[PDB]
Design a protein around this ligand. Structure first.
Ligand code: NA
Ligand code: NA
Ligand code: NA
Lengths: 85, 88
């Protein structure tokens, strides 16, 4: 059972879903959906921060317990002050 | 090595993205997006090729795939996306 779904409420009246994958061998991933595309991300720092696997994307997901923030480019905010719902 | 994205061309000028998760130890999952939600799915250990069902029992999406082809249905095999093939 290596896959799970989280839903967050974020600033400016928005919702962010994240699918988390945690393999039995210890590899962690996250998938978000932005602009009608699903973007797979890999764990890069450990709260827990994930970065897009496809280098053509610059999305980064920073999580800390039940909170999160999604940025792009030079840590420019996309979704801020996210909290687990 | 474990996560990949497939894009399918389907009937009626529709496109379907699927994220496939295939772990090193051989476990298989899929993720699709419908009605603006991501739906995680698990492989059904059944007749080839690779058929998936939503992990959340509130959803009735099933994804049936065979080689390069796929079909997405819901409920009693009600078509959602039909005659899908890997884009080429
Ligand atoms: Na981007
Ligand atoms: Na047709
Ligand atoms: Na693999």
């Amino acid at each position: 059972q290596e896959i799970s779904k989280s839903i967050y409420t974020c600033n400016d009246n928005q919702v962010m879903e994240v699918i988390y994958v945690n393999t039995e061998a210890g590899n962690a991933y996250a998938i978000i959906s932005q602009v009608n595309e699903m973007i797979p991300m890999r764990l890069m720092k450990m709260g827990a921060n994930y970065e897009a696997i496809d280098k053509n994307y610059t999305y980064k997901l920073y999580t800390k317990g039940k909170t999160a923030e999604l940025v792009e480019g030079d840590d420019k905010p996309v979704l801020s002050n996210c909290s687990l719902a």
